[PDB]
Structures are given as C-alpha cells and as structure tokens.
C-alpha cells in the first residue's frame, strides 16, 4: 500500500506537465530548457602550497522556449519586433511544474528580466509530417527556484 | 465533436504545405529554412553590481531554399549568373503556409531584399535513386512575419 | 562452490549501490562522476640526450552529481543561492560503495573542500516520460580514496 | 613539497622598495587583487645546500 | 663603497572609466570648469566592497 497522497509528498516529479507564465499571461509551450545557475571560478596559488578556490561572479542565463505555430496572432513575433536599439519590454518568466489538473505548483523556476534575442522559423519540408515550431531564446539576469 | 472549422482556428499548422512567392512569380520548392530573427547582446557591468543587459543590432538572415532540376529553363541559374560586381536584382521572398487547396494564407514569413550567394549542383551518383536537387542560399536584411 | 563470503573478498564491486555523504547529511543521488586524480607534466631535455620526465602539480577535480526533483525543499538550490562574492559553505563529500543493506563501506572516494559552481534545470518537454533531474557540478581541491 | 627542505636559494642582501602597484579594478574580471613591489638591492648570491 | 637611497616619490596618474548615460555627464562638468590654474580638487576613495 502506497496511498497516493504519499506519492504527492515523496515521489519525484516528471517533466511533461508545466505551465509557463510569461509576464502576466500564460502561453502554452512545448519545450523549455536552459534555466541554469552558473558561476565562474577564482583561483590563487602561492609558493608555499596554499591553493585558494573561490566562486566568481555568476553569468547570465540563456533560456530557450519552443511552441507551435497557430493560425491566429503571433505573440512571440510581436515581442521581438518591438526592439528599438535598447528598448524591449522585459518580462518575468515563471515555469512551474504543476499537477495534472493545472491548478497548483509543485516546484517553480523563476526568471527575472528576460528579453528575446532570437526567434527561429520552422523548417519547411514538403516530405514531412510535422508541426511548425518556432523556437525563441531569451536572455535574463537571475534564475530563482521557489518550492511550495 | 470537433467540427473542423474549429480545427482551422485553434489547431496548429503543419509544414508540408507552403507557397514560395519569389519576387513576382511562384516557384515550387521542396525545402525552405533559415528565416530567423537574431539579435546581438550589449552588456555593461560596474563595480557596484549593476549588470545592464540590452539587445544589440540584428544581423542579416541567411535563407536556404532547395528545389529539383527540371528539363526546361533554370530560373535560379539565370538569377545568380546576373552578378556584375555589385549588381543583382534583389527580390522579395514570401513563404506562406497555405491551405490544402493553395488559395489562402494561414501565416507567412516575408523577406525583404534577398540576393543569391550560392547555388550547389546535385550530387551525381550512378548507384542512387534520387532526384537532382539544387540548393540556393540567399542573403537579406529583414524577416517579417505576417499572420492572417 | 564459491561460498559467498568469498565473493565479498575477491570479486569486484558494481557501481549501482552508493551512499553520498554531503557535509554531515546523506542526500540520495542518481549519478556521480568526475572524482579524478590528475597531474601535470614537467619535461626537460638537454643536448646530450637526457630527457627528464616529472609529475607536475595536481589540478582541481570537477565533480558532477545529479538527483531528481522532489516536491519538498530543494537543498541544492539553498547551497548555491548562498554565494556572496567569495563566501560559500564548503562541504566534505563522501561517495562510498556500500553493501546492499546500506550499512558498511566497501571502498570510498573522499572529496575535501567542495563548493557548487553550476546547477542545471531539468529539460521540460511535453512529449517525454522522464523525471526532472537537476545536475550540480562541484569544485574541490583533493580526492582521497579510503578502502576498508 | 612538504616544505621541510631547501634545495637551492637566492640571497638578496640590502633591499628596499622603490615601487608598489595597486590592483587593476575591473568590473568584468574574475581575478584576484594582485599587488607587485619592486625592490632595489646591491648583490645577489646563490647558496646551494 | 656604493650607497643606494630612495629618492622622492613622483605623482600618481589615476585612470577611471565609466559608461555614457542619458542623464548629465558628471565627469564633464569637473573637467569643463578648468579656469587656467583652477580646479575643484577632490579626494577619491576606491574601496573593495563585499
């Protein structure tokens, strides 16, 4: 007997159920990767033998998202077209592993000030049964993990 | 019940049905890729801790198209042979995901001032049952996505 | 007749049963690699023919660990979030090949002063039946093998 | 290694500082603040023991 | 006999670089106000901070 309320406490979480909160809206995505926390390394050696190893300064995350092309309005083109030499609406990204109903967060990866740097077109092929998938890559400053 | 007029509103679009408008003519192509929107990155750090992340200037797209070799007149050789040291007829590329009849656009990727930079011959092999496919690569300045 | 108390003396040890002691706590991990002992090389040649080959100074190990995402509190985020420009709680890593009961060490790999340098998010994919796996990489100064 | 045996040494006799450089502060660098001092002496000898 | 002595120290040349911001240029209004001998001389502290 494992009594599935205990599965919701001590079993791990899969990666197929996630909600992406993009600014103040929810946008359905297919994939999401690159929400890393990376530091640099400071080193210092003297002649006596002391090696000093230290964390450096953390560098920027590069988050890539991908969703399909729908017949309506393209919300990801409208956010990468509004670039005027510096000026982009930064957004808060929230990617939360959710329950199957979609109403409560298991664990979330938060992203502070993201702006788009690329947007790839789908690969058009007359001999392929696939869905047109755009892939946007984002650049931010901080990745935060809230667990609840 | 899904009532297929609702499939034309809220289901995604596949990549096997597309019309390529090449200047003022329609040319049948097999593949089409590389219609990306890429920016550079400006960064600035001071000693107090402020990291300033900014979009740079967007660079040029490199679009590659490929079609088969037909017994008539080669229209892609006639456009890469008319290079005189600067002088090329720039064309407007339109690659539109279309319905199955071919008469109305679902979503389109527009390309502003494209000119050819390469044209590859097919690979001749006496032990292969394949079609002779030329592959032309283009260089432009802007990629626009119109949705209708 | 092989009399399995002799298997515990002269047969080799598999890699699927291991306990990771992380500071003063045991944390369950899925994978663990990179606990190497690497030296540099000094060389010296003269005109008479004497080649002099010598071990240099040993460089730092880079240990990578990976475990799954659980619904409770993230202990590996709480240790990489506590970086203030130099200041990290260094920990002692012990990765011991253990018996099947989990109560006695066969051979252990000890790691002296480890601190986190990276922490990767899981790859979110809507078409995948996988477990959310974080992967932390550590940097230390010494790798010790105790056998008992 | 252990630090318990001197192999060969260089002996600087009457040194005094003539320069001291500060570290180079740079907000985009993962480095250690390193000073260097230049000294001026009168003789350098080598004892080999 | 060969005597070696420290001389007298020479003056430092500091170099500070920052970016151009949309406000006012505070480094400019301190080098613009040079009247032929005169300059508001300031005292600078460069502190390695946590």
From TrEMBL, chains A, B, C:
UniProt keyword list: Plasmid
GO MF term set: structural molecule activity
InterPro entries (UniProt xref): CHP02241, Phage_T4_Gp19
A family per Pfam: Phage_T4_gp19
Protein name as catalogued: Afp1
Lineage: Bacteria, Pseudomonadati, Pseudomonadota, Gammaproteobacteria, Enterobacterales
Gene: afp1
Automatic annotation (TrEMBL), chain E:
Single Gene Ontology MF annotation: structural molecule activity
Keyword Protein transport part of the UniProt annotation: no
Lineage top rank: taxon: Bacteria
Record keywords: Plasmid
Entry keyword annotation includes Nucleotide-binding: no
Protein known as: Afp1
Portion of the full-length sequence here: 51 to 100 of 149
């Amino acid at each position: 007997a494992i009594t599935a309320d205990d599965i919701a406490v001590q079993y791990p979480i899969p990666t197929y159920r996630f909600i992406v909160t993009l600014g103040d809206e929810q946008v359905p995505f297919t994939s999401a990767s690159g929400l890393d926390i990376n530091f640099d390394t400071i080193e210092y050696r003297d002649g006596t033998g002391n090696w000093f190893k230290m964390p450096g300064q953390r560098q920027a995350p590069n988050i890539t998202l991908s969703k399909g092309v729908f017949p309506g309005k393209n919300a990801m083109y409208e956010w990468i077209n509004a670039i005027q030499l510096n000026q982009v609406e930064k957004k808060d990204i929230m990617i939360s592993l959710t329950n199957e109903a979609g109403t409560e967060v298991l664990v979330s990866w938060n992203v502070s000030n993201a702006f788009p740097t690329s947007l790839t077109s789908p690969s058009f092929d007359a001999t392929s049964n696939e869905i047109a998938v755009q892939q946007i890559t984002l650049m931010a400053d901080r990745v935060t993990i809230q667990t609840a």
